[PDB]
């Protein structure tokens, strides 16, 4: 197939073409694109915390090259596009655009299908690493919390964060208890650990945020001894000092927060491009009125009523050393 033939079949804007030329001159990944299929997909879907829902509704759309020939183009050289970065995390996260919903189950579960493809390749990674196995679980189990996602954001089956799944695809991320770690280097070369919060696993509870913490160094000095990161790194809504005039003593941000240093300037007042990232991950916010969003945690209440005030939201990044 023609990249030009492919985008049209599948409906992705003529941005898009650059990618496509670029997936087209890589060309097939050397390994075979192989989906699991059946009683072996529903067991992986289930070892990645997927949703029974979801897994089922994954399962029974998996496409096939003869009946998909566009998609399953795009699949196996998105794929091999991943897979060509294993282990570095100098490489930006291009995971590919997502597929119009016109195209149904299989556009909106392609980069499910693209994950179950890559979840050998990745875990072939972490045993030559000498991660064990409990670790590399419990790290692409994230798979299932997007997908879960999705379907709480828009009200059907998907995964939309790609970009992000680049990490875990290409080993460079790993949850260690209640935080993950990304290997990462700040503009100078630097090595540093990205440290990132997934939603599920409960609060951010000091005993379980502390520990994690003690985890990283020990973990990326046996696996990646030539890292040697000493520092974690965060840019985050939870890091807005703002939050303080609204959530109280007893708020785990509240408490967590002091730790860190931030490095960033005190944004301008008026500058909004922090309020997209706040709602996106207290309400997964897709354009509702905001008096339609619930109200039932402080947190909740306080997003909505600092920009009902007309103020503004903002990232905020800082530092703790690594214990
Ligand atoms: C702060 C130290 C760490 C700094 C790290 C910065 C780097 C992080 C880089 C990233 O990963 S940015 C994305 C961070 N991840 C998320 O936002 C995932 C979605 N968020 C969550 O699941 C929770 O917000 C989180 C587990 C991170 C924290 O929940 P906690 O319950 O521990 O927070 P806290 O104790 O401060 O909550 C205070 C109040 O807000 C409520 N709350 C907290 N998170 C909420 C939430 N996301 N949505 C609705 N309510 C929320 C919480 O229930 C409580 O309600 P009440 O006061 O009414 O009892």
Same mark, same amino acid.
Do not use: C
């Given at each position: 197939?023609?990249?030009? $033939?492919?985008?049209?079949?599948?409906?992705?804007?003529?941005? =898009?073409?650059?990618?496509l030329?670029?997936?087209?001159?890589?060309?097939?990944?050397?390994?075979?694109?192989?989906?699991?299929?059946? %009683?072996?997909?529903?067991?992986?879907?289930?070892?990645?915390?997927?949703?029974?829902?979801?897994?089922? %509704?994954?399962?029974?759309?998996?496409?096939?090259?003869?009946?998909?020939? #566009?998609?399953?183009?795009?699949? %196996?050289?998105?794929?091999?596009?991943?897979?060509?970065?294993?282990?570095?995390?100098?490489?930006?996260?291009?995971?590919?655009?997502?597929?119009?919903?016109?195209?149904?189950?299989?556009?909106?579960?392609?980069?499910?299908?693209?994950f179950?493809?890559?979840?050998?390749?990745?875990?072939?990674?972490?045993?030559?690493?000498?991660?064990?196995?409990?670790?590399?679980?419990?790290?692409?189990?994230? @798979?299932?919390?997007?997908?879960?996602?999705?379907?709480?954001?828009?009200?059907?089956?998907?995964?939309?964060?790609?970009?992000? =799944? $680049?990490?875990?695809?290409?080993?460079?991320?790993?949850?260690?208890?209640?935080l993950?770690?990304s @290997?990462?280097?700040?503009k100078?070369?630097?090595?540093?650990?990205?440290? #990132?919060?997934?939603?599920?696993?409960?609060?951010?509870?000091?005993?379980a945020?502390?520990?994690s913490?003690?985890?990283?160094?020990?973990?990326?000095?046996?696996?990646?001894?030539?890292?040697?990161?000493?520092?974690?790194?965060?840019?985050?809504?939870?890091?807005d000092?703002?939050?303080?005039?609204?959530?109280?003593?007893d708020?785990?941000?509240?408490?967590?927060?002091?730790?860190?240093?931030?490095?960033?300037?005190?944004?301008?007042?008026?500058?909004?491009?922090g309020?997209?990232?706040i @709602?996106?991950?207290?309400?997964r916010?897709?354009?509702?009125?905001?008096?339609?969003?619930?109200?039932?945690?402080?947190?909740?209440?306080?997003?909505?009523?600092?920009?009902?005030?007309?103020?503004?939201?903002?990232?905020? $990044?800082?530092?703790?050393?690594?214990?």
């Open positions: 197939m023609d990249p030009e $033939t492919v985008r049209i079949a599948l409906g992705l804007e003529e941005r =898009t073409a650059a990618w030329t670029e997936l087209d001159e890589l060309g097939p990944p050397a390994e075979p694109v192989r989906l699991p299929r059946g %009683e072996e997909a529903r067991d992986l879907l289930r070892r990645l915390e997927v949703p029974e829902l979801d897994a089922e %509704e994954i399962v029974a759309a998996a496409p096939d090259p003869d009946r998909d020939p #566009a998609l399953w183009w795009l699949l %196996e050289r998105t794929h091999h596009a991943i897979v060509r970065h294993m282990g570095d995390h100098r490489a930006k996260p291009r995971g590919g655009p997502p597929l119009p919903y016109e195209g149904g189950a299989a556009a909106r579960y392609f980069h499910v299908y693209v179950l493809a890559t979840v050998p390749a990745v875990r072939r990674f972490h045993a030559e690493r000498g991660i064990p196995d409990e670790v590399g679980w419990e790290t692409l189990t994230q @798979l299932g919390e997007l997908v879960a996602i999705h379907r709480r954001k828009y009200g059907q089956g998907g995964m939309n964060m790609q970009w992000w =799944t $680049t990490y875990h695809l290409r080993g460079i991320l790993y949850r260690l208890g209640r993950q770690f @290997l990462a280097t700040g100078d070369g630097t090595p540093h650990l990205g440290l #990132a919060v997934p939603e599920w696993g409960g609060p951010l509870l000091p005993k945020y502390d520990e913490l003690h985890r990283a160094r020990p973990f990326f000095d046996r696996h990646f001894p030539e890292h040697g990161a000493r520092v974690a790194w965060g840019s985050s809504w939870m890091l000092p703002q939050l303080e005039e609204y959530l109280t003593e708020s785990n941000i509240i408490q967590l927060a002091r730790f860190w240093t931030l490095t960033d300037s005190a944004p301008e007042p008026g500058n909004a491009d309020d997209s990232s @709602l996106e991950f207290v309400f916010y897709n354009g509702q009125p905001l008096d339609e969003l619930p109200q039932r945690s402080s947190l909740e209440r306080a997003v909505i009523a600092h920009l009902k005030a007309g103020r503004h939201w903002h990232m905020r $990044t800082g530092f703790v050393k690594l214990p």
